[PDB]
Amino acid sequence: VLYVGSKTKEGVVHGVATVAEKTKEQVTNVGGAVVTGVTAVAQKTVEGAGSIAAATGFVKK
Amino acid sequence: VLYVGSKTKEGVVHGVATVAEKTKEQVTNVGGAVVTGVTAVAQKTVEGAGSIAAATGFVKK
Amino acid sequence: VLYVGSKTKEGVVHGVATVAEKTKEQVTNVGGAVVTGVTAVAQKTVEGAGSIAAATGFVKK
Amino acid sequence: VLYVGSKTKEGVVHGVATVAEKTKEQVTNVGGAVVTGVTAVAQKTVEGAGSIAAATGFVKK
Amino acid sequence: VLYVGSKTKEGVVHGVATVAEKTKEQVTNVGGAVVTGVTAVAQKTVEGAGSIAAATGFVKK
Amino acid sequence: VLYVGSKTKEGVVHGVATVAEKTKEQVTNVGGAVVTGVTAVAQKTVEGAGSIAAATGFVKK
Ligand SMILES: COc1ccc2nc(/C=C/c3cnc(N(C)C)s3)oc2c1
Ligand SMILES: COc1ccc2nc(/C=C/c3cnc(N(C)C)s3)oc2c1
Numbered sequence: 350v351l352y353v354g355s356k357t358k359e360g361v362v363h364g365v366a367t368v369a370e371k372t373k374e375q376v377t378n379v380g381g382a383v384v385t386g387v388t389a390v391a392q393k394t395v396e397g398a399g400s401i402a403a404a405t406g407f408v409k410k
Numbered sequence: 411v412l413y414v415g416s417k418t419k420e421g422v423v424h425g426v427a428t429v430a431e432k433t434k435e436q437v438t439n440v441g442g443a444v445v446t447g448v449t450a451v452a453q454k455t456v457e458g459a460g461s462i463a464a465a466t467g468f469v470k471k
Numbered sequence: 472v473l474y475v476g477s478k479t480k481e482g483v484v485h486g487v488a489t490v491a492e493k494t495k496e497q498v499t500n501v502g503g504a505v506v507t508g509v510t511a512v513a514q515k516t517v518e519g520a521g522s523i524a525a526a527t528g529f530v531k532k
Numbered sequence: 533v534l535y536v537g538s539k540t541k542e543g544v545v546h547g548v549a550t551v552a553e554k555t556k557e558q559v560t561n562v563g564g565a566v567v568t569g570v571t572a573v574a575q576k577t578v579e580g581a582g583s584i585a586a587a588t589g590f591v592k593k
Numbered sequence: 594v595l596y597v598g599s600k601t602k603e604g605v606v607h608g609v610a611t612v613a614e615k616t617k618e619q620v621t622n623v624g625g626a627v628v629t630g631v632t633a634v635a636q637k638t639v640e641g642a643g644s645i646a647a648a649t650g651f652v653k654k
Numbered sequence: 655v656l657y658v659g660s661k662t663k664e665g666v667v668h669g670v671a672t673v674a675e676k677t678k679e680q681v682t683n684v685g686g687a688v689v690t691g692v693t694a695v696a697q698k699t700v701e702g703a704g705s706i707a708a709a710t711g712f713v714k715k
Contacts, residue, residue, distance in 0.1 A: 350411045350412075351411065351412045351413065352413045353412075353413065353414045353415065354413075354415045354418075355415065355416045355417070356416065356417045356418075357415045357416075357417075357418045357419075358418070358419045358420070358422050359419075359420045359421060359422075359454045359515075360420070360421045360422070360452050360453045360454040360514075361419070361421075361422045361423075361424070361452060362422075362423045362424065362450055362451070362452050363424045364424045364425045364426070364551050364553055365423075365424075365426045365427075365428075365450045365551070366426070366427045366428070366549040366550055366551045367426075367427075367428045367429075367430075367449070367450075367549060368428070368429045368430070368547050368548065368549045369428075369429075369430045369432075370430075370431045370432075370546075370547055371430075371431075371432045371433070371434075371435055372432070372433045372434060373433070373434045373435065373436075374434075374435045375435075375436045375437070376436075376437045376439075377436075377437070377438045377439065378439045379439065379440045379441060380440070380441045381439045381440065381441045381442045381443055381444070381500070381502075382439070382442075382443045382444070383437060383439050383443075383444045384444070384445045384446070384463075385437065385444070385445075385446045385447045386446075386447045387447065387448045387449070387451060387463075388447075388448075388449045388450055388451075389449075389450045389451075390450075390451045390452075390453075391423075391451070391452045391453065392453045392454075393453065393454045393455075394453070394454075394455045394456070394458060394460070395456045395457065396456070396457045396458065397455075397457070397458045398455070398458040398459045398460065398519070399453055399455045399458065399460045400460070400461045400462075400464065401448070401451050401453055401461070401462045401463065402445055402448045402451070402462065402463045402464075403445070403461055403463075403464045403465075403466075404443035404444060404445045404464075404465045404466070404504075405443060405466045405468075405469075406441065406442050406443045406466055406467045406468035406469075406502075406504070406529065407441070407468045407469075408468070408469045409468070409469075409470045409471070410471045411472045411473075412472065412473045412474065413474045414473075414474065414475045414476065415474075415476045415479075416476065416477045416478070417477065417478045417479075418476045418477075418478075418479045418480075418481075419479070419480045419481070419483050420480075420481045420482060420483075420515045421481070421482045421483070421513050421514045421515040422480070422482075422483045422484075422485070422513060423483075423484045423485065423511055423512070423513050424485045424553075425485045425486045425487070425551050425553055425612050425614055426484075426485075426487045426488075426489075426511045426551065426612070427487070427488045427489070427549040427550060427551045427610040427611055427612045428487075428488075428489045428490075428491075428510070428511075428549055428610060429489070429490045429491070429547050429548070429549045429608050429609065429610045430489075430490075430491045431491075431492045431493075431547055431607075431608055432491075432492075432493045432494070432495075432496055433493070433494045433495065434494070434495045434496065434497075435495075435496045436496075436497045436498070437497075437498045437500075438497075438498070438499045438500065439500045440500065440501045440502060441501070441502045442500045442501065442502045442503045442504055442505070443500070443503075443504045443505070444498060444500050444504075444505045445505070445506045445507070445524075446498065446505070446506075446507045446508045447507075447508045448508060448509045448510070448512060448524075449508070449509075449510045449511055449512075450510075450511045450512075451511075451512045451513075451514075452484075452512070452513045452514065453514045453515075454482075454514065454515045454516075455514070455515075455516045455517070455519060455521070456517045456518065457517070457518045457519065458516075458518070458519045459516070459519040459520045459521065460514055460516045460519065460520075460521045461521070461522045461523075461525060462509070462512050462514060462522070462523045462524065463506055463509045463512070463523065463524045463525075464506070464522055464524075464525045464526075464527075465504035465505060465506045465525075465526045465527070466504060466527045466529075466530075467502065467503050467504045467527055467528045467529035467530075468502070468529045468530075469529070469530045470529070470530070470531045470532070471531075471532045485614075486612050486614055486673050486675055487612065487673070488610040488611060488612045488671040488672055488673045489610055489671060490608050490609070490610045490669050490670065490671045492608055492668075492669055533594045533595075534594065534595045534596065535596045536595075536596065536597045536598065537596075537598045537601075538598065538599045538600070539599065539600045539601075540598045540599075540600075540601045540602075541601075541602045541603070541605050542602075542603045542604060542605075542637045542698075543603070543604045543605070543635050543636045543637040543697075544602070544604075544605045544606075544607070544635060545605075545606045545607065545633055545634070545635050546607045547607045547608045547609070548606075548607075548609045548610075548611075548633045549609070549610045549611070550609075550610075550611045550612075550613075550632070550633075551611070551612045551613070552611075552612075552613045553613075553614045553615075554613075554614075554615045554616070554617075554618055555615070555616045555617065556616070556617045556618065556619075557617075557618045558618070558619045558620070559619075559620045559622075560619075560620070560621045560622065561622045562622065562623045562624060563623070563624045564622045564623065564624045564625045564626055564627070564683070564685075565622070565625075565626045565627070566620060566622050566626075566627045567627070567628045567629070567646075568620065568627070568628075568629045568630045569629075569630045570630065570631045570632070570634060570646075571630070571631075571632045571633055571634075572632075572633045572634075573633075573634045573635075573636075574606075574634070574635045574636065575636045575637075576636065576637045576638075577636070577637075577638045577639070577641060577643070578639045578640065579639070579640045579641065580638075580640070580641045581638070581641040581642045581643065581702070582636055582638045582641065582643045583643070583644045583645075583647065584631070584634050584636055584644070584645045584646065585628055585631045585634070585645065585646045585647075586628070586644055586646075586647045586648075586649075587626035587627060587628045587647075587648045587649070587687075588626060588649045588651075588652075589624065589625050589626045589649055589650045589651035589652075589685075589687070589712065590624070590651045590652075591651070591652045592651070592652075592653045592654070593654045594655045594656070595655065595656045595657065596657045597656075597657065597658045597659065598657075598659045598662075599659060599660045599661070600660065600661045600662075601659045601660075601661075601662045601663075601664075602662070602663045602664070602666050603663075603664045603665060603666075603698045604664070604665045604666070604696050604697045604698040605663070605665075605666045605667075605668070605696060606666075606667045606668065606694055606695070606696050607668045608668045608669045608670070609667075609668075609670045609671075609672075609694045610670070610671045610672070611670075611671075611672045611673075611674075611693070611694075612672070612673045612674070613672075613673075613674045614674075614675045614676075615674075615675075615676045615677070615678075615679055616676075616677045616678065617677070617678045617679065617680075618678075618679045619679075619680045619681070620680075620681045620683075621680075621681070621682045621683065622683045623683065623684045623685060624684070624685045625683045625684065625685045625686045625687055625688070626683070626686075626687045626688070627681060627683050627687075627688045628688070628689045628690070628707075629681065629688070629689075629690045629691045630690075630691045631691060631692045631693070631695060631707075632691070632692075632693045632694055632695075633693075633694045633695075634694075634695045634696075634697075635667075635695070635696045635697065636697045636698075637665075637697065637698045637699075638697070638698075638699045638700070638702060638704070639699075639700045639701065640700070640701045640702065641699075641701070641702045642699070642702040642703045642704065643697055643699045643702060643703075643704045644704070644705045644706075644708060645692070645695050645697060645705070645706045645707065646689055646692045646695070646706065646707045646708075647689070647705055647707075647708045647709075647710075648687035648688060648689045648708075648709045648710070649687060649710045649712075649713075650685065650686050650687045650710055650711045650712035650713075651685070651712045651713075652712070652713045652714075653712070653713070653714045653715070654714075654715045
C-alpha cells in the first residue's frame with residue numbers, strides 16, 4: 350500500500366560500445382525463422398510474457 | 411505493505427565494450443530456428459515468462 | 472510487510488570487455504534449433520519461468 | 533630503386549571500443565605540464581622526431 | 594634495390610576493448626610533468642626519435 | 655638488394671581486452687615526472703631511439 354522508488358532502474362542498458370568489422374554476412378532461410386544481430390535492447394513487461402530474440406520454427410495444428 | 415527502494419537495479423546491463431572482427435559469417439536455415447548475436451540485453455518480466463534468446467524447433471499437434 | 476532496499480542489484484551484468492577475432496563462422500541448421508553468441512545478458516522474472524539461451528528440438532503431440 | 537607496397541599499414545589504429553564511466557575527474561596544474569586522455573592515436577613521421585603524449589617540465593637556459 | 598611488401602604491418606594496434614569504471618581520478622602537478630591515460634596508440638618514425646608517453650622533469654642549463 | 659615481406663608484423667598489438675574497476679586513483683607530483691596508464695601501444699623506429707613510457711627526473715647542466 351506504499352511504493353517509494355528512487356533511482357530505481359529496471360531493464361536498463363547503458364554505456365555500450367560496439368565495433369563490428371566484417372567482410373561478408375549472409376543469411377539463407379527456407380521456411381523457418383532466423384533472428385540475428387540484437388544489441389543493446391531493454392524492456393519491461395507487466396502482466397504478460399516478454400521475449401527478446403525468440404525464433405519459432407512453425408506451429409502446425 | 412511498504413516497499414522502499416533506493417538505487418535498486420534489476421536486469422541491468424551497463425559498461426560493455428565489444429569488438430568483433432570477422433571475415434565471413436554465414437547462417438543456413440532449413441525449416442527450424444536459428445538465434446545468433448544477442449549482446450547487452452536486459453529485461454524484467456512480472457507475472458509472465460521471459461526468454462531472451464530462445465530457439466524452438468517446431469510444435470506439431 | 473516492510474521491504475527496505477539500498478543499492479540492491481539483481482540480475483546485473485556490468486564491466487564486460489570482449490574481443491572476438493574469427494576468420495569464418497558458419498551455422499547450418501536443418502529442422503532443429505541453434506542458439507549461438509549470447510553475451511552480457513541480464514534479466515529478472517517474477518512469477519514465471521525465465522530461460523536465457525534455450526534451444527528446444529521440437530514438441531510433437 | 534623499386535618500392536612495391538600492397539596493403540602496407542604503418543602507424544594504424546583500428547577497431548577500438550572504449551567505455552569510460554567516471555564520477556569525478558580533476559586535474560590541478562601549477563607551472564608544469566599535464567597530458568591526460570590520449571586514445572586511438574596514430575601517426576607516421578619521416579625525417580623528424582615524433583612524440584605522441586609527451587610532457588616536458590620546463591627548459592631554462 | 595628492391596622492396597616488395599605485402600600485408601606488412603608496422604606499429605599497428607587493432608582489436609582493443611577497454612572498460613574503465615572509476616569513481617574518482619585526481620592528478621595534482623606542481624612544476625614537473627605528468628602523463629596519464631595513453632591507450633591504443635601506434636606510430637612509426639623514420640630517421641628520428643620516437644617517444645610515446647614520455648615525461649621529462651625539467652632541463653636546466 | 656632484395657627484400658620480400660609477406661604478412662610481416664613488427665611492433666604490433668592486437669586482440670587486447672581490459673577491464674579496470676577502481677574506486678580512487680590519485681597522483682601527486684612535485685617537480686619530477688610521473689608516467690601512468692599506458693596500454694596497447696605499438697611503435698617502430700628506424701634510425702633513432704624509441705622510448706615508450708619513459709620518465710626522466712631532471713637534467714641539470
Ligand atoms: C516475494 O514475492 C516477490 C518476488 C519478487 C519480487 N520482486 C519485487 C520488486 C518489487 C519492486 C521493484 N521496484 C519497486 N519500486 C521502485 C516501487 S517495487 O517484488 C517481489 C516480490
Ligand atoms: C637495414 O636498414 C633498415 C632498417 C629498418 C627498416 N624498415 C624498413 C621498412 C621499409 C618499408 C616499409 N614499407 C615499404 N613500402 C610499402 C614501400 S618499404 O626498411 C628498413 C631498413
